[PDB]
Design a binder for these strands. Structure first.
Length: 226
RNA sequence: UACCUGGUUGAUCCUGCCAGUAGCAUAUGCUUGUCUCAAAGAUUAAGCCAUGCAUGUCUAAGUACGCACGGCCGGUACAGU
């Protein structure tokens, strides 16, 4: 060879524990609900199963005395089929740059989904935990559980997101405008997010509590480290 | 298969209709090699009709002098068909 690599040097505390390798799953991060700020952290644990699916590339434009001025705004989905999905929108003066700007922003906003069973257990979840909703500006979706082998029955736009989530079988119902897909996709994304925030009788058992990764590994975060 | 997509603006988010989509049954266009199943003058004029046909029927057992046939030998109630 004659060419090295050097990629990523964290300037963030959370980034430093991952690069020095003390955190070894996303599940640690999420349990303390820490901010994520660097898009390499997510792409280190994953990035070996993340795909992108560019939904729309939509023009928008404002008005000035010299005429039109046009910016391109594109939406880009991201997700592995193991239950982590995310979504981002971004705009720029040119097309390709806006797409690549959206793939970064989408990595940042990745969240987990909680899957469950129709009513009888047989191992390996296949549907949504419970009947949930999510609204974004008078578009809404109502993800309703479904038995095995019925597939995802939805419009083409949410059929992307739910498929990327790894949710196998679902029924949906929409209300209001859905031709303004920027709302429609965010409303789907809203619905899948709420799954872990829905309290179920399962979760009534008490959580132990444990000290933060920041707390326990603080001796490695002070030597010269950020 | 518990589903949507295009269109009011310089641009955005709504309200709302229009158009797109699929099945079903009537008509119609164009095209048609083999097999099984088969709906068919209802929609309008319960308007009008040539011609042909669509309800007849006898057992040992209601009535046989058909001069019909037959008999064989006829008639005494009197054969058989």
């Amino acid at each position: 060879g004659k060419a090295g690599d050097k990629e990523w040097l964290p300037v963030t505390k959370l980034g430093r524990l991952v690069k020095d390798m003390k955190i070894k799953s996303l599940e640690e991060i999420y349990l303390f609900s820490l901010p994520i700020k660097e898009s390499e952290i997510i792409d280190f644990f994953l990035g070996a199963a993340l795909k992108d699916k560019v939904l729309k590339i939509m023009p928008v434009q404002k008005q000035t005395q010299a005429g039109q001025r046009t910016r391109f705004k594109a939406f880009v989905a991201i997700g592995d089929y193991n239950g982590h999905v995310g979504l981002g929108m971004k705009c720029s003066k040119e097309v390709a740059t806006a797409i690549r700007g959206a793939i970064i922003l989408a990595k940042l906003s990745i969240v987990p989904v909680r899957r469950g069973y129709w009513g009888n257990k047989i191992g390996k979840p296949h549907t949504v935990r419970c009947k949930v909703t999510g609204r974004c500006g008078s578009v809404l979706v109502r993800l309703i559980p479904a038995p095995r082998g019925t597939g995802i029955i939805s419009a083409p736009v949410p059929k992307k997101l739910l498929l990327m989530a790894g949710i196998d079988d679902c029924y949906t119902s929409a209300g209001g405008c859905t031709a303004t897909l920027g709302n429609f996709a965010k409303a789907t994304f809203d619905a899948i997010s709420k799954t872990y925030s829905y309290l179920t009788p399962d979760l009534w058992k008490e959580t132990v509590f444990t000290k933060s990764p920041y707390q326990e590994f603080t001796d490695h975060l002070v030597k010269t480290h950020t």
